[PDB]
Design a protein around this ligand. Structure first.
Ligand SMILES: Nc1nc2c(ncn2[C@@H]2O[C@H](COP(=O)(O)OP(=O)(O)O)[C@@H](O)[C@H]2O)c(=O)[nH]1
Length: 170
C-alpha cells in the first residue's frame, strides 16, 4: 500500500538534503504489535505512507550493482538537478530515459526539481527547465533546503502524480 519514491540525479545536487528535510517534517511513530519492537517509524505525505530511496550513480555508486533495481522498484521519481550546475541539468535526460527503458514504460510518474534555488550563481534558467518538463509532460518546481522553498511541494506533487497513475492503472 506504500508509495515508493526515488530521488535521482547527479552527485552533489542535494538529494540527501532534500530527503532528510522531508523525513524531519513528516516522520511519525506508528503502533504495530505484529513486529517485535511494537513501533515503527514511517513517513506520511499527503495522506499516503511513503518509502524513500536515493539513486546516485557516481562516487561509491560507480561500483554498485543496484541501479536498475532502484529504477524497477521505484513508483515515482524526483529528478533533481542544481540551478548552479549546468552539467547536472544536462544529465537529467539520461536518467529519465534509463528509467523509462528499465521500467519498460512510457508513463512513469516524475517531477523535475531544480534545487539550490537560494544560490545567486544560477546557470540553469527557470524557463529552460520548464521547457524540459513540458516536453516530458511533468511538473517542475524549484527548491532550496536552505530556505525550505518548494521542498514539501516537490514531494507532495510527486505523491499526487503517483496517485493519479495508480488510479489509471486501476
Ligand atoms: N545552497 C544550497 N546548498 C545545498 C542545498 N541542498 C543541498 N546543498 C548542499 O549541497 C551539497 C550536496 O548535498 P547532498 O545532499 O550531499 O547531495 P547528493 O549528493 O545529491 O545527495 C551539500 O554541501 C549540501 O549542504 C540547497 O538547497 N542550497
Amino acid at each position: 500500500t506504500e508509495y515508493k519514491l526515488v530521488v535521482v540525479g547527479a552527485g552533489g545536487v542535494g538529494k540527501s538534503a532534500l530527503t532528510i528535510q522531508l523525513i524531519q517534517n513528516h516522520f511519525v511513530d506508528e503502533y504495530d504489535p505484529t513486529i517485535e519492537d511494537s513501533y515503527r517509524k514511517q513517513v506520511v505525505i499527503d495522506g499516503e505512507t511513503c518509502l524513500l530511496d536515493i539513486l546516485d550513480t557516481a562516487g561509491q555508486e560507480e561500483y554498485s550493482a543496484m541501479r536498475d533495481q532502484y529504477m524497477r522498484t521505484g513508483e515515482g521519481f524526483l529528478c533533481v538537478f542544481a540551478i548552479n550546475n549546468t552539467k547536472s541539468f544536462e544529465d537529467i535526460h539520461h536518467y529519465r530515459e534509463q528509467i523509462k527503458r528499465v521500467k519498460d514504460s512510457e508513463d512513469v510518474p516524475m517531477v523535475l526539481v531544480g534545487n539550490k534555488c537560494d544560490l545567486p550563481s544560477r546557470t540553469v534558467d527557470t524557463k529552460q527547465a520548464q521547457d524540459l518538463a513540458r516536453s516530458y509532460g511533468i511538473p517542475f518546481i524549484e527548491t532550496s533546503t536552505k530556505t525550505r522553498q518548494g521542498v514539501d511541494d516537490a514531494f507532495y506533487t510527486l505523491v499526487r502524480e503517483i496517485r493519479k497513475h495508480k488510479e489509471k492503472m486501476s
